[PDB]
Prior knowledge:
This is part of a larger assembly, with chains A, B, C, D, E and F. By secondary structure, chain C is of the alpha+beta class. Helices cover 45% and strands 15% of the residues of chain C. In chain C, a hairpin with a 4-residue loop joins strand 1 (29-34) and strand 2. In chain C, helix 3 packs parallel to helix 4 (104-114). In chain D, strand 7 (60-67) and strand 8 (70-76) form a beta hairpin. Chain D is an all-beta fold. Helices cover 29% and strands 16% of the residues of chain E. The complex binds magnesium ion (26 copies) and zinc ion. One magnesium ion binds at residues 25-26 of chain A. The structure holds two RNA strands. It is classed as ribosome/antibiotic.
Amino acid sequence: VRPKITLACEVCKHRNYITKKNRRNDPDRLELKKFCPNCGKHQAHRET
Amino acid sequence: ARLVGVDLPRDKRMEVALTYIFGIGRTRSNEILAATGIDRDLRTRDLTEEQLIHLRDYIEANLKVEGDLRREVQADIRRKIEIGCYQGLRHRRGMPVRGQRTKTNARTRKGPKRTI
Amino acid sequence: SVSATRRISRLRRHTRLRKKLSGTAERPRLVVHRSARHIHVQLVNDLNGTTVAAASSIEADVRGVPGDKKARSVRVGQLIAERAKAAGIDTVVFDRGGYTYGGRIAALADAARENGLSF
Amino acid sequence: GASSSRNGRDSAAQRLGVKRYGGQVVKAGEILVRQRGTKFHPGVNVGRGGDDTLFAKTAGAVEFGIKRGRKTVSIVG
Amino acid sequence: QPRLKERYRSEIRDALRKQFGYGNVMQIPTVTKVVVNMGVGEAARDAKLINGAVNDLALITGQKPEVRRARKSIAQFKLREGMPVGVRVTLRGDRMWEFLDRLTSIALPRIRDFRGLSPKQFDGVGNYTFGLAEQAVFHEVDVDKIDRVRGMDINVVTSAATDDEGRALLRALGFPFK
Amino acid sequence: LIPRKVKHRKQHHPRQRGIASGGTTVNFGDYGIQALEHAYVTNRQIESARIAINRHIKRGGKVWINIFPDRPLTKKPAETRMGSGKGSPEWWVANVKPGRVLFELSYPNEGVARAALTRAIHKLPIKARIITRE
RNA sequence: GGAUCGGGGUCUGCAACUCGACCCCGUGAAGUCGGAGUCGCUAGUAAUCGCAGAUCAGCAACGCUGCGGUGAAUACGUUCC
RNA sequence: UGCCUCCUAAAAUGUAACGGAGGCGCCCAAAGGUUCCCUCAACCUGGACGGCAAUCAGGUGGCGAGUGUAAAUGCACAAGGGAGCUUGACUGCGAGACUUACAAGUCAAGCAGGGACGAAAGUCGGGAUUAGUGAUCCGGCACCCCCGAGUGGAAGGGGUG
Ligand SMILES: [Mg+2]
Ligand SMILES: [Mg+2]
Ligand SMILES: [Mg+2]
Ligand SMILES: [Mg+2]
Ligand SMILES: [Mg+2]
Ligand SMILES: [Mg+2]
Ligand SMILES: [Mg+2]
Ligand SMILES: [Mg+2]
Ligand SMILES: [Mg+2]
Ligand SMILES: [Mg+2]
Ligand SMILES: [Mg+2]
Ligand SMILES: [Mg+2]
Ligand SMILES: [Mg+2]
Ligand SMILES: [Mg+2]
Ligand SMILES: [Mg+2]
Ligand SMILES: [Mg+2]
Ligand SMILES: [Mg+2]
Ligand SMILES: [Mg+2]
Ligand SMILES: [Mg+2]
Ligand SMILES: [Mg+2]
Ligand SMILES: [Mg+2]
Ligand SMILES: [Mg+2]
Ligand SMILES: [Mg+2]
Ligand SMILES: [Mg+2]
Ligand SMILES: [Mg+2]
Ligand SMILES: [Mg+2]
Ligand SMILES: [Zn+2]
């Protein structure tokens, strides 16, 4: 009910960040602006 | 159109529409519409404000209305309770006061069936 | 009373901000006090509590400013900035004194920023 | 017999308490009092810590004091 | 300019002079605010309050009301925290004045079997509370476009330090008493 | 005498060292039994002493018990090895120290009260004495 | 729908509270067709509407015995009750 | 039977028993970050439905409330209540500490990158804190292109997560 979801950068597809989330509290695949070291800047890191 | 506080519903005729008032019946309406000149066949949605003035004084000066009948009726039944009369005791105990039969009846003064 | 409630609430607010903002000899507290009529400001450096500079809208040179309390706040802002320069101070921390940032207080702070004093 | 071992477990002792006492010379970053909650408060030159650890920002001497009821730890450089 | 106010300054202030000997001109009490509260328990069921107890006071008080939320949980009342359980408005200023003026003028004497309302209802400091039981008290709301009838409970909060002067200023404003 | 509830049903033994610091003088009655040694005094002992008092006086006067057996003493079931947990509380005990006043009498007659009080001391697991309100 | 209540009354009766009938105003309950079960009725019948009488000063006359206005639908038949 | 909290535990730390008590094997996309604002419970007085206790008003009330969750230590300066904007629930690090048989565990100023909030000062490397966890092995996946069994690839291996 709290799976480990990985966040991938939208630009270089780089799966960077792993965190947890409540599927029932938010069923949709969430997005956060995270810092991408490959891009060297913050971009959207949507789940896989 | 609130007449005196009873708030007559629209689309209604005078002679019965006035009867919703607590204290004014059909026979009473026959005179509230007679001493004011308002015809029997009318729609209350067509009531003129000047006419409502013509009956906003006649009722209060020659009739008696909500509140100042309910207060009187509770006042005198209270007087029968306080004076310790047969009617007062009967009214407290909730069975008929006018000598009605109390063996297979008195359901109106009592409640629904009990079936002990 | 309404005045007591305002004074207590404003002291509460300013203590709240004073927990984190302190001001020192090199970068002091530029603390504001606006009444309904005037605004005073004073540069505190509260390691010993020695006000190194002060200004107000009470002296005639700010009284005679053509305009309203916005202008009489920008006047006192430039004034405290120039005598902070005179005292040898160029960077401060700005203490809202417990009032909302905005209005005459923000006008004073902006005037103090525009002419050398660099919080 | 009764199996009254309903309560025989405990957690590890976490070695809390004051680690550097008053007047003791410490280097920067060195933890002074590890504790639960803010039994002591960070004074001048003392940081708090994510688990309320009260380390030293700068080298110098530990001193304990009172700041409006709150008891505090500071370093004098 | 509200006429009850202009006449308030015209005679009630100096009447309060001639009645109470206040040493300073600002000791004179005044109605500081008027709080009108719904106290609706019939909203925790089916959560209907918007067009019943909001669009009515939008026309009555003239100002959009606050939805007072629950603060604790009560099992006997089937209520939990975070449900709309009241509706409140706090009136100040000329519009509060006009609200009392209209109320005493063309609204208050219309309630059924009304003869004046209790003067003992004071809380001991100089504030007054009472209630009503029907929306048609005001012309602004009609009966062919409303739901079931309800009522509002009114606090009137004055600067009076005690009950005799609170009641004195309410009477001078025009509140009926028995 | 039984506590109507206790926060901690299994306590350590109350500690019998030192002179009693409170409840040392006669405070309600005019006669008192005062302890001269440490003991745990059970509720049964207290009750038996109280009955001894009240049916040596039979009437009149009144008896104060400024000692309450609210400290539990546990007991392992009768036929058991050591150490499978603490026993269940079954004795209720008051920790009396030398100098604690255990019982007080008010009685108009002197000798009857004194004899009743000694009758109670003989009921107690303790050396005690009669003291007065000066 | 007209029970229910307050108030005001008429008549009878020595007398109307226990316990009479009738009248006026306002008040306006239960009751929206009634379960299991059960009743009457084949023609001027059921149904429905009044009128009259005996008893009776008065009457709880909706009871009982009578009079007339309007006025039906069905019965193939005896398997079953 | 591991972990967390208290008492035992003898006022540093630590300290045993099949000693006394409880919790945990999560939860939260906000219940995180930040900025700003607020103060609770209880009691008393008055008030349509409403009563002891729903909402309201006024007093009194410094913490007796609350804290996602046990207990302790804390927190009213709030860490408690509310609102706006956000993703620092970062990447590269890390002087120096605590703790410790080892393995582990814990704290950390501060520097840089790129951001959030803030007018600034600043704060932010999840959550008031301390449980919510599992070494190594062996594998999986994404990326990097490091090695590539004659050579070019590839297979396979390696690194980072
Ligand atoms: Mg959500
Ligand atoms: Mg421990
Ligand atoms: Mg943490
Ligand atoms: Mg003591
Ligand atoms: Mg009818
Ligand atoms: Mg019905
Ligand atoms: Mg119907
Ligand atoms: Mg007859
Ligand atoms: Mg006869
Ligand atoms: Mg017939
Ligand atoms: Mg210790
Ligand atoms: Mg020790
Ligand atoms: Mg367990
Ligand atoms: Mg947040
Ligand atoms: Mg908070
Ligand atoms: Mg994470
Ligand atoms: Mg390091
Ligand atoms: Mg930066
Ligand atoms: Mg900015
Ligand atoms: Mg940092
Ligand atoms: Mg937690
Ligand atoms: Mg192996
Ligand atoms: Mg090759
Ligand atoms: Mg080859
Ligand atoms: Mg490969
Ligand atoms: Mg690395
Ligand atoms: Zn990227």
